[PDB]
Amino acid sequence: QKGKAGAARIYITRNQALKKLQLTLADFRRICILKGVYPREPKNKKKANKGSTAPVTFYYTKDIQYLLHEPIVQKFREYKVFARKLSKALGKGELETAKRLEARKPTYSLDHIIKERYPTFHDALKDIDDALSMLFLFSTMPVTDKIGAATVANCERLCAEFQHYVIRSNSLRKAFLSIKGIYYQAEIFGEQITWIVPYKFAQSVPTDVDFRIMHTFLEFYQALMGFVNFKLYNTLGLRYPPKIDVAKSESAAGLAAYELEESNTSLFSNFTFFLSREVPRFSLEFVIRAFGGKVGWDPILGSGSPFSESDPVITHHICDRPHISQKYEGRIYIQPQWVYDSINKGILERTDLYACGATLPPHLSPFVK
Amino acid sequence: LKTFELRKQSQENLAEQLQELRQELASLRVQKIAGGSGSKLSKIKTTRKDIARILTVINESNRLAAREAYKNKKYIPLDLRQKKTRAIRRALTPYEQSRKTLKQIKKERYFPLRKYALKA
Amino acid sequence: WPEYIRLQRRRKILNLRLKVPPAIAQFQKTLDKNTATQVFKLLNKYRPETAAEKKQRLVAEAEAVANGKSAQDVSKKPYNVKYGLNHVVALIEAKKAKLVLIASDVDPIELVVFLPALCKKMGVPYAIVKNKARLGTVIHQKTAAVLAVTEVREEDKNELASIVSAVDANFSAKYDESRRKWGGGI
Amino acid sequence: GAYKYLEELAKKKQSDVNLFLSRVRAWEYRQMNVIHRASRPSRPDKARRLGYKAKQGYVIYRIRVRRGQRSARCTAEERVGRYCSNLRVLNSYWVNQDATYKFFEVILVDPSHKAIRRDPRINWIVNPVHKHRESRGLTSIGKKSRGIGKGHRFLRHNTLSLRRYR
Amino acid sequence: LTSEQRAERERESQSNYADHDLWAPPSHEESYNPPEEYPKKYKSLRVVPAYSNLIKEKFERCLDLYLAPR
RNA sequence: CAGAAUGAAUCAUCGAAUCUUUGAACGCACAUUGCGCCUUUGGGUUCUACCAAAGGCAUGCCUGUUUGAGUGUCAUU
RNA sequence: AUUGGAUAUGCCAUAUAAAGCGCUUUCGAAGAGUCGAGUUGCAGCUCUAAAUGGGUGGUCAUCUAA
RNA sequence: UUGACCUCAAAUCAGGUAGGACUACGCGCUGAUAAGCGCAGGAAAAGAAAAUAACCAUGAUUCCCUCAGUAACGUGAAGCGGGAAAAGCUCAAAUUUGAAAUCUGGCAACAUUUCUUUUGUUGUCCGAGUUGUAAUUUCAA
């Protein structure tokens, strides 16, 4: 008698995984982003689906039963109880118990779910690209209903800490200014990691990406950004998390706000470059700090600039605007295409090639070979 | 084997000491159907008793490590409870036995049975 | 149908098809929607303090005493609505209550069946409102049976003299013959 | 309180109010089980007077009995006490009847509940001598049945007493 | 703990961001002025618009790891 | 009797443990002999197979927790 | 070695409290299909109370059930 | 759409609980006391008067002697008196209303033990409870 073992034993359906775990669709999709499980296709799906021929998603039983002992599943159901205690409080007009329970809103911990799925920190370094990219993704858009306004500050703090620690360790090696934005390819603790960052533009809601699924996926990426910061700052001797200057944050100093206090990397180190209010100086200062160069900026570009527009210490006062009426002597106005090529070629690129009012060359991919 | 110096080594060291003590006994019953000396039937006796010492030892290194595990706990399993008598486990405790109202607390701090005497 | 639902619609209808005595007949004619939204608006100032935040003011009262300060000498007599069946029967017999509120769904109906007769005799203006649980929400309870205002402060006395006049004029002034005839048998 | 009014009302058992609730509740009590748990006592005054405090551990049951030869109230104490093997019986009173069934309720107390056991007004029933009181005729109506009272109304000779010196 | 202590011992908490250590395709040479093919060619970085498909692309890649098989 | 000898003792006491299958007998049926289900672990170079081990699966009732159902009672500008 | 009620003594306690008895220009709540009568083998069935009332005994004495 | 509340369910949910054996002695059930049925403890039943008495009054219950083979109708008491032992009381019914003052449970600390096996205290969060949990009172008042 078939229908007891073979493929149909280890392989089981999506609906059956709802029956054997006692969850719903929105409950099942909620947890398998934090915990890594993806559908697995049999080599023969008719035998595995107990003779039927419908198109049906399939799962190992060794992971769907490994899901049973997870105490985070208890936190979700004990989040169901809370809102049916808060609505009991809010629905009976008692405002004060409605305030007293939201502070003790039950929150699970993301410690033991990052323990088992990423064993090695180097393996965690290998899978830190998409999480950091997502950390750099939602950190510049407006506040969304399903997205967390407080988590937006976490997205701002985690990416800056990733920017400050990499700049302190000079981990960034390759950088390309592609059509999408500035793709930064770094290498920390041996693992070479590439992260793509877009330009700060007037974005709009796409009305098609599930922000509910995004808020869950961002929460899975919020732990890895901090845990790596807990590891990288300990590796570099800095504070995890580093002390952040709110006054410099209110003045938009970037990595200068998050003070990294201790608890060819010199391609442009001998070049104190300044900037006007014509380009994305946030990544420009990150590229300069990763390459050892002193980064200046205009007051409109942001406060905390070590070098001003009138400062004669500007080695290469790069201006994205081709018309630089205040181009100082010794601060020749160049374009970011030369600096991007300088980050690509690893040497001091020709500022006369990609100058302000000069032809920018074709920027190839730094990761390409 | 002297049971006081069995407890001076960890649990796993009692572990590999367990089977070859059996493999001696497992081999020693083969000689009974083979036929041998009479002093090994004394060795039959003292290998079972030596089997029956380490098993006493290892079991008391599990339960005594469980008791240190279940300190301070409101609930402990059944096998570590009292086994006195069913009528003793399910009867009142002297706390609840000696619980009084507030009325019989007042009536025995202003009016207790004092000690007195007479004179014959 | 399940084993219990076919009872749950039938005891709904046997209260209708039978002869309701005039004592019980008044327990279905009930204060309306409108005038039962201002009574609970006046009461929602005089709720009893929630047991969690009575303690909150008690730790703030007992911390200054542990230093030497006090507030018992300047503590004015408190206010709230008065609830509980046995405390409100004695608040009517002593002519202390001024507005008695009777739930319309007390399960053993004998618990409140003497109250519209006691309120008629002692001269305490009364009304029968819906949903015992609605009273329960007022006083932080699951199911209340009755409430009573016995003393509002000088702030709402002028409001209370008006809202009672809505209670007599709609419940007591009306409903005067349906309480004097049998009900049910529909 | 309300229990004064609810005692004198519960005596006028045949009057129009006490008869209307009799017909109504006998209907609901009859479609329910022969023994089914209450959630509140139907007579919350008689229950309060016979011993029932409204705390955890006090369980109200109610049971119909066929009319028409042990006293019916006594069997309502026994049949509920055989349906609940843990609960200790306190009392059992009359709540309703009709031409074919008498309805009673019973007050039952959990002896294992650590709220009865911590309370010195009901702690006499945790003791093991009170095991199945309704069996031994040791309760409110099992005492009245067997003529245990005070009054001329309600082997000690059949053995010869042969002393040592006689 | 008194009434002020009811307040200030709630305030050192709720700061939980990794306070202990748990560990004890590429670009196709596409840019503003890519001359390999003639997407589009952008003369100036300020003239380059915003590629709005990145939100739908990154979400699709995120949803592929959890819903699409592998 | 042999037996080892030199903490012996079919010793005494006894507070920690062991207690086979049954039996109120309790995962199901029986008188043997079986039939199963759930979770965990291990095994033999596969948890696509197989086996084993370990922990659970009687009923009634009580207290509490979670999930619900009710053309059962109502409120929601 | 476990355990008893004590004696003395040390530290705690929280007492803004609780209790005995005078004194009352004041009040004083008391258990129901039970009691009770009729009637079949203390039970069954029919009926069904009251507040100086109700019970049992010689107008009195004595008690306070459900 | 939503939210309370009532009722009813479901859970290998959390913690508990009931059977069965002995039955000399105890208490009930029917019963030709015998047999059968049920139910407990080291004792149990009984118990602080809806009791006697007709006195100059006695004073919960139990048991022995006596009353006594007596009254009353072959059956067969009881009051009084004499002993042993003596311990009394707890609720319902009155509003804590100037404040549900009450309690189970979950978690965490502190102890503590016939005992790492026992038994609690304190803090905290639900929950029970105004259809009434504590204080007060039981007619002797």
Going along chain D from its start, the domains and CATH numbers come out as 2-146 (3.40.1120.10)
Structure tokens at A116: 């088992």
Residue A37's alpha-carbon distances to A17, D19, E63, in angstroms, are 12, 68, 12
Which residues sit opposite C129 in a β-bridge? C103
CA diameter of chain A: 89
- Residue pair B63/B44 in contact by the 8 Å Cβ criterion: no
Identify the closest residue of chain C to A90 by CA–CA distance: C137
For the beta carbon of residue A170, count every other beta carbon within 10 angstroms. Answer: 17
CA diameter of chain E: 74
Chain H positions under 7 Å from a protein CB? 2-9, 14-19, 27-30, 38-52, 60-61, 63-65, 69, 76-78, 90-112, 114-120, 125-137
Can you give chain A as a three-state secondary structure string? Answer: CCCCCCHHHHEEEHHHHHHHHCCCHHHHHHHCCCCCCCCCCCCCHHHHCCCCCCCCCEEEHHHHCCCCCCCHHHHHHHHHHHHHHHHHHHCCCCHHHHHHCCCCCCCCCCCHHHHHHCCCHHHHHHCCHHHHHHHHHCCCCCCCCCCCHHHHHHHHHHHHHHHHHHHHHCCEEEEEECCCEEEEEEEECCEEEEEEEECCCCCCCCCCCCHHHHHHHHHHHHHHHHHHHHHHHHHHCECCCCEECHHHHHCCCHHHCEECCECCCCCCCCCCECECCCCCHHHHHHHHHHCCCCECCCCCCCCCCCCCCCCCCCCCCECCCCCCCCCCCCCCCECHHHHHHHHHHCCCCCCCCCECCCCCCCCCCCCCC
Which of A45, A103, A107, A100 is CA-nearest to residue A76?
A107
For the beta carbon of residue B101, count every other beta carbon within 10 angstroms. Answer: 11
Distance CA A290, CA A264 (A): 10
Structure tokens at E50: 């915003």
Its sign, for the CA torsion D124, D128, D134, D136, is negative
Q: What angle is formed at CA A95 by the lines to CA A93 and CA A96, rounded to 5 degrees?
A: 135
| Host H or E run for residue D46 | helix D46-50
Which of C31, C41, C22 is CA-nearest to residue C169?
C31
- Nearest protein residue to nucleotide G57 (CA to C1' distance) is D152
Distance CA C83, CA C91 (A): 10
Residue B21's alpha-carbon distances to A6, B18, B57, B62, D118, in angstroms, are 42, 6, 14, 20, 55
Residue B56: what residue type?
Answer: T
Structure tokens at A351: 């500022």
Give the dihedral of Cα atoms D141, D143, D146, D151; nearest 10 deg. -120
Going by their DSSP bridges, the two strands C126-129 and C99-103 should be labelled as parallel
CA atoms lying within 13 Å on the CB side of residue C72: 6
Question: Inter-chain contact C23–D27, Cβ cutoff 8 Å?
Answer: no
- Residue pair A190/A166 in contact by the 8 Å Cβ criterion: no
| Host H or E run for residue C134 | helix C132-138
Q: Which residues of E touch A121 (CB under 8 A)?
A: 23
**Burial class of E54 by CB neighbour count within 10 A (0 to 12, 13 to 18, 19+):** middle
Structure tokens at A365: 């991919």
Distance CA C100, CA C150 (A): 9
For the beta carbon of residue D139, count every other beta carbon within 10 angstroms. Answer: 22
- Residue pair A37/A17 in contact by the 8 Å Cβ criterion: no
Distance CA A258, CA A281 (A): 17
Q: Which of residues 79-118 of C touch strand F (CB under 7 A)?
A: 104-105
SS3 state of residue D101: strand
For the beta carbon of residue B62, count every other beta carbon within 10 angstroms. Answer: 9
Going by their DSSP bridges, the two strands C82-83 and A172-177 should be labelled as unpaired
Going by their DSSP bridges, the two strands C146-149 and C99-103 should be labelled as antiparallel
DSSP state of B74: S
- Residue pair A328/A314 in contact by the 8 Å Cβ criterion: yes
Chain D residues with CB under 8 Å of a chain B CB are 112, 117-121, 123, 126-128
Which residues sit opposite D60 in a β-bridge? D107
Determine whether the distance from the CB of D59 to the nearest atom of strand F is below 7 Å.
yes
Distance CA B1, CA B18 (A): 12
Q: What angle is formed at CA A137 by the lines to CA A133 and CA A142, rounded to 5 degrees?
A: 165
- D40 CA → H11 C1’, Å: 25
Can you give A181-235 as a three-state secondary structure string? Answer: EEEEEEEECCEEEEEEEECCCCCCCCCCCCHHHHHHHHHHHHHHHHHHHHHHHHH
End-to-end CA distance of chain A: 57
Distance CA D44, CA D46 (A): 6
Compute the count of residue pairs across chains B and D with CB atoms less than 8 Å apart. 21
Instruction: Please name the residue that has the structure tokens 């009142």.
Output: B92
- Nearest protein residue to nucleotide H40 (CA to C1' distance) is D129
Cis peptide before A241 (omega within 30 of 0): yes
Question: Inter-chain contact B99–D127, Cβ cutoff 8 Å?
Answer: no
Distance CA D37, CA D39 (A): 7
Distance CA A132, CA A193 (A): 10
Residue A23: what residue type?
Answer: L
Instruction: Please name the residue that has the structure tokens 């600096």.
Output: A339
Residue D138: what residue type?
Answer: L
Distance CA A21, CA A73 (A): 10
DSSP state of C56: H
Structure tokens at E49: 């618009």
SS3 state of residue D64: strand
SS3 state of residue B87: helix
Which of B105, B86, B101 is CA-nearest to residue D118?
B101
Distance CA A71, CA A82 (A): 17
Distance CA D161, CA A270 (A): 128
End-to-end CA distance of chain E: 56
What distance lies between CA B68 and its chain's CA centroid? 14
- Residue pair A173/A192 in contact by the 8 Å Cβ criterion: yes
